[PDB]
Amino acid sequence: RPEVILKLALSADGMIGRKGAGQVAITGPVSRAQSHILRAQADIILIGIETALADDPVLNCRLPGLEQRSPVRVVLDGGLRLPLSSRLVRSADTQPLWVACGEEAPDERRAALGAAGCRILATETIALPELLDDLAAQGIASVLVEGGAGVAKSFLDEKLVDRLIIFRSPLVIGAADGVAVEGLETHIASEFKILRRMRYADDACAEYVRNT
Amino acid sequence: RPEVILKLALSADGMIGRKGAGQVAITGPVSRAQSHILRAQADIILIGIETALADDPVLNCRLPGLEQRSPVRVVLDGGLRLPLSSRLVRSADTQPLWVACGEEAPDERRAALGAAGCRILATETHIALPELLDDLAAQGIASVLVEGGAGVAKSFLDEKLVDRLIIFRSPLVIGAADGVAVEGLETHIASEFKILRRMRYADDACAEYVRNT
């Protein structure tokens, strides 16, 4: 089973996004550099389809001299809903892109993505513990999960996270329009210990490791 | 009492330097980037006078967009042996340089470094690391990055002042004839630390550890 790092981008008041939208922007320079370093140290970067649709991300490493360390990308996409116009699918020849779906997605979206250069990854029931067993059989030693609320909650609830890194924006979103990861603080309290805390308000970061 | 990260660059046979020259250079791109991000995350980067003399370092952050986050540099230098020709001293306008002293060093070298732009940091001798960190916390320092040669690396580890240990490992061998090791390093890791992450790729290898408590 690969080492699993979950990286979360939160607002100052602990929200993982605005209702109906994508991820919280992290803008401090130390946090942005560390963010790209995590990608270079990972074998795989994993996100959910909900994040892919809302943010249209690329998930490559952009530190000068480290672009060749851009990891394999995995999208958890039960319905093979990934747009062929996405930045992800359109960079599939220049960086690996694996789309995880089970024996349920229609062959026409299965065939269109494969012809565009995506590898289609077979999964059970979506079963996170033996997706990580499957990912490990294919040579992966470390997975970086860049979650929205869905992937973050599911990985934590199933207790599959080894290290947790939380970047906190200085800006407040508000409970009226914010989405939180529910159970985040109780999981940290129950299962994690703090390792380092960066206290600059424009560049705030907290790192945790799972309890011994 | 601030958080202390000890960063060691070792050869394949575990030497932190060689007796006649400079330290083990890190060459992998991920390891280089991470080394400079540790500097950016630190309030203070601390080294010993022996490393300063052997390597003539600069100790700034050379990541583009982070150079303004080069930390204050601290050199443990009981005899004020740091040359005014050092790249460190000659860099004093562009990055803070504090030279740590005993209560005893002649006032003549205090003034010369002062004129070159260095702050002189008064410390307690026997040079007391626990008291230096309390003094540093008293000045608002939240985190210290120690880039030790064998001297300070052994001293911070022996007095149990290291919370996190980061070891970059070169694939090259230095040899027992000229190699200097951190004495007691492997027993300290077995006794007080757990592995946290490891990058095994041979041209960019790293292991990180955290103290058990």
SS3 helix, strand, coil % of chain A, rounded to 5?
30, 25, 45
H or E element that contains A166: strand A163-168
Does A199 reach chain B within 8 Å, measured CB to CB? Answer: yes
Q: Determine the Cα–Cα distance for residues B157 and B155; give it in Å rounded to an integer.
A: 5
Q: Does B142 touch chain A (CB under 8 A)?
A: yes
In chain B, which residues have their Cβ closer than 8 Å to the Cβ of A37? 30, 33-34, 37
Could you tell me which residues come within 8 angstroms of residue B28 by beta carbon, excluding any fewer than 6 positions away? B168, B201, B203, B204, B205
CA distance A41 to A69: 8
Q: What is the structure's resolution, reported in angstroms to one decimal?
A: 1.9
Provide the shortest C-alpha distance from residue B85 to chain A (in Å). 32
d(CA B195, CA B161): 18
Experimental method: X-ray
- Distance (Å, whole) CA A59 – CA B58: 34
Q: Show the tokens assigned to A69.
A: 């360390």
Opening angle at CA B98, ends B97 and B99, nearest 5: 120
Instruction: Give me the sign of the Cα torsion angle A172, A178, A179, A183.
Output: positive
Beta strands B179-181 and B119-122 are unpaired
A66, B33: Cβ pair inside 8 Å? Answer: yes
Q: For the CA atoms of B39, B42, B44, B46, what is the dihedral angle to 10 degrees?
A: -60
Q: What is the DSSP letter of A24?
A: P
Closest residue by Cα to residue B153 from B192, B185, B123, B127: B185
Both tokens of A21, joined, read 């939208």
For residue A184 the two structure tokens come to 């985040």
A38 and A5 Cβ atoms separated by less than 8 Å: yes
CB A44 within 8 A of CB A73: yes
